[PDB]
Design a protein around this ligand. Structure first.
Ligand SMILES: [Zn+2]
Ligand SMILES: [Zn+2]
Ligand SMILES: [Zn+2]
Lengths: 120, 76, 76
């Protein structure tokens, strides 16, 4: 009974964490980006793309073509080197949290449903 | 409460804490159990980074919740 | 990140910039290094004249890229 609610809450919390943490393929360490490009060099030396999480060998993974400001690239569809995914990742996290809190309210009743840290 | 901490290597350790405990105290317990100095630890819970001076209860960290130790790096 | 600026004479200037920096900030760095006020600078990259209000990332300027400086003299 209670174990089922604990399992659902913790699964939602882990999905919310997985939408923010980037896991390295070499050493298996969780990573987050402070600033800079989306080309991430983990402490172990392995490189990856912060956007698609695929192992890469350098900058040839990203779009390196001149762009018109505020327009998509007209030569390729490769990952952007400078786009910050923080806003989209937070929208994903908040939608998962909102839907999970609605599901928890549907299961238990219309009277504590909050899963994860609050908003601002 | 009982919580779990996933380290940088991927190992899962079990901590006995209280929701009124501060983030520094949890980091100190992590140092006591694994030997990781608190100045090197960055904790993530449900996608949110836990900042010093705050408590577990600020983040709605409940029993059997999982904190994650992450490296924060600059991009190329 | 590090970028280069080539003048018409061929001289290479080396700048330490960030992808969030605007073109105005790059011209301020050029003023600090060479003594040319930004009102005299025209920055061109891949055939595009760069507008001051936008950033390096808006033009997808890469690391170790080369911009070209052209001089404008209104005062004589
Ligand atoms: Zn690694
Ligand atoms: Zn990618
Ligand atoms: Zn492109």
């Amino acid at each position: 009974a209670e174990k089922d609610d604990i399992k659902y809450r913790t699964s939602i919390e882990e999905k919310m964490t997985a939408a923010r943490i980037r896991k390295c393929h070499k050493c298996g360490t969780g990573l987050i980006k402070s600033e800079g490009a989306n080309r991430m060099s983990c402490r172990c030396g392995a490189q990856m793309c912060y956007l698609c999480r695929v192992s890469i060998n350098g900058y040839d993974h990203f779009c390196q073509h001149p762009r018109s400001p505020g327009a998509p690239c007209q030569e390729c569809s490769r990952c952007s080197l400078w786009t910050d995914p923080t806003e989209d990742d937070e929208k994903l996290i908040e939608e998962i949290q909102k839907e999970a809190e609605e599901e928890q309210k549907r299961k238990n009743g219309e009277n504590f449903k909050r899963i994860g840290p609050p908003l601002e | 409460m009982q919580i779990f901490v996933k380290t940088l290597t991927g190992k899962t350790i079990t901590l006995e804490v209280e929701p009124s405990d501060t983030i520094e105290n949890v980091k100190a317990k992590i140092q006591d159990k694994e030997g990781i100095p608190p100045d090197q630890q960055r904790l993530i819970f449900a996608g949110k980074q836990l900042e010093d001076g705050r408590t577990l209860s600020d983040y709605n960290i409940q029993k059997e919740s999982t904190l994650h130790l992450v490296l924060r790096l600059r991009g190329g």
